[PDB]
């Protein structure tokens, strides 16, 4: 109505007293005044976020009621590309879509649209095509192949098609099967990529940059110039004006790390990510999705798959004196039991690093080096917040005096990514 869309990253909620408050998720603050005080304590709830997001998604009435597609299962990717990118009005895709498979053969997954989304997600997110490549830490999470242009001549068009399909999945309530690294979702949100975010992108770059961050680079005799092995011929690039003859020292460290990350990761995938976002936003402006975090954005796109805590517990190995009968371990599992399904998935993302659970269960759970199981290691003083390592699926759980303290600390850590 006359009020208009809320500013990006804002939400409106109804209090039990009936007065409506406004929550800024970027700063995590509640207020009474309309954006266009204490109010209620901030509570990041994915269910209410999703309800608000779906409510503010409005289907145009001018478009045809039904969006009809005919595809061949042998190569679903190609006909899907042709049909979806042949549409000049993206709003037509906002209309309900019924994908009549060839000869109505079947193979449904509870819905022909869901079956189409499943098979297409299998096809697009296969690194064989070259658009995407498996993450460094995991073997199932994906990322944009920086060399995607070399393999595919029209990689930008295919990335736009993938973005359009993802936008369709989010808009229509269906779910995609591909899980991306955290920097992927951060680049959707327009957030800043940090050194930790490189853990998924490349192990060599992350390890070298971490060494530089912690130790004095003066031993390495580093300049503000990096060598671009990619592209024909090997040549040096200055990260800052007069990069050569400028030496990386303790005062020039974080600037060097930021510039190296920008040149070697962000600059390389920026074009492909921009094409993906251009395809994605044709059905959902970024402002609506900016309320979600990267973790919540992953859940919104790939869905909230219920996690069986019994299988999770049985196929878990404890470390540093923790035992299944240990009071802290069973208290932690009690806290996991009482916590919601979305909170359980957020705990998975906090420790494992992704919401994907292997189809065989938690026995096949992987890691940076290889097959690695969920680990809960004793570490730190009781007061400290739990920490997580997603390269080895490790939760550094301090020994907690009582169940209530452990529950509160674990919830605070899970909520604060």
């Amino acid at each position, epitope marked *: 109505n006359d009020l208009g869309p809320l500013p990006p990253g804002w939400e409106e909620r109804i209090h039990l007293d009936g007065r409506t408050f406004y929550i800024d998720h970027n700063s995590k603050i509640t207020q009474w005044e309309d954006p266009r005080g204490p109010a209620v304590p901030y509570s990041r709830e994915f269910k209410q976020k999703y309800d608000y997001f779906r409510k503010k998604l409005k289907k145009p009435a001018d478009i045809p009621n039904r969006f009809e597609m005919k595809l061949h299962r042998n190569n679903i990717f190609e006909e899907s590309y042709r049909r979806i990118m042949s549409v000049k009005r993206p709003d037509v895709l906002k209309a309900r879509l019924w994908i009549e498979f060839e000869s109505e053969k079947g193979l449904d997954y509870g819905g022909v649209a869901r079956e189409w989304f499943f098979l297409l997600s299998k096809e697009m997110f296969n690194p064989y095509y070259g658009l995407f490549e498996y993450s460094a830490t995991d073997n199932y999470t994906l990322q944009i192949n920086p060399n995607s242009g070399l393999c595919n001549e029209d990689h930008l068009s295919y990335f736009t098609f993938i973005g359009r399909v993802a936008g369709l999945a989010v808009f229509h309530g269906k779910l995609l099967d591909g899980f991306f690294i955290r920097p992927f979702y951060k680049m959707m949100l327009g957030k*800043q990529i940090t050194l930790n975010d490189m853990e998924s992108v490349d192990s060599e770059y992350y390890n070298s940059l971490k060494w530089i961050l912690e130790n004095d680079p003066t031993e390495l005799d580093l300049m503000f110039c990096i060598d*671009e092995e*990619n*592209f*024909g*011929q090997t*040549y040096q*690039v*200055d*990260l*800052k*004006p*007069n990069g050569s*003859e*400028i030496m990386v020292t303790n*005062e*020039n460290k974080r*600037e060097y790390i*930021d*510039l190296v990350i*920008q040149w070697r990761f*962000v*600059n390389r995938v920026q074009k492909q990510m921009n094409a993906f976002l251009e395809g994605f936003t044709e059905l959902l402006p970024i402002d609506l999705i900016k309320i979600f975090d990267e973790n919540e954005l992953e859940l919104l796109m790939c869905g909230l798959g219920d996690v069986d805590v019994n299988d999770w517990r049985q196929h878990s190995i404890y470390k540093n004196g923790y035992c299944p009968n240990h009071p802290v371990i069973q208290w932690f599992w009690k806290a996991v039991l009482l916590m919601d399904a979305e909170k359980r998935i957020r705990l998975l993302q906090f420790v494992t690093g992704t919401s994907r659970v292997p189809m065989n269960g938690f026995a096949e759970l992987y890691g940076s080096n290889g097959p690695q199981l969920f680990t809960i290691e004793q570490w730190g003083s009781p007061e400290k917040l739990p920490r997580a390592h997603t390269c080895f699926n490790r939760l550094d759980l301090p020994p907690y005096e009582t169940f209530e303290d452990l529950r509160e600390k674990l919830l605070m850590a899970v909520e604060n990514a």
Partner: nanobody, 122 residues
Framework: QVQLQESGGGLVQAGGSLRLSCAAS????????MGWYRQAPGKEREFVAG???????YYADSVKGRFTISRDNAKNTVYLQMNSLKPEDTAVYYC????????????????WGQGTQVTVSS
């Protein structure tokens, strides 16, 4: 090609404020780094401030706290404001830009300003 000209540079008492503006002309497609450099009498050029990408701003430890670097997109002009100015600040202030141009492989083109003598009186 891009050409830079720095103005706003004049002798000022120490503890005075100087703003240096880098007027940039030409096709500034995508600036990788907008920096202010300093050349003291008898010394090589040394980094003073940098805008780099987005809004991340990097300062030299000598000028950290005292100076502030900003960019105006409509004018594409960078302003370095120096406060608590000191004799060390007396050097000649250049303005450099790096434009990442993509022909075959993407490469960095560095364009340097003429410079303004900024001095401190005390």
């Amino acid at each position: 090609q891009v050409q830079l000209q720095e103005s706003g540079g004049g002798l000022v008492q120490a503890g005075g404020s100087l703003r240096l503006s880098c007027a940039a002309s030409g096709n500034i497609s995508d600036v990788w780094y907008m920096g202010w450099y300093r050349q003291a009498p008898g010394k090589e050029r040394e980094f003073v401030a940098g805008i780099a990408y987005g809004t991340s701003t990097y300062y030299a430890d000598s000028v950290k706290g005292r100076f502030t670097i900003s960019r105006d997109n409509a004018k594409n002009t960078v302003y370095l404001q120096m406060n608590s100015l000191k004799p060390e600040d007396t050097a000649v202030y250049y303005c450099a830009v790096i434009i990442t141009r993509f022909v075959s492989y993407p490469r960095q083109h560095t364009y340097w300003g003429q410079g303004t003598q900024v001095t401190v009186s005390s």
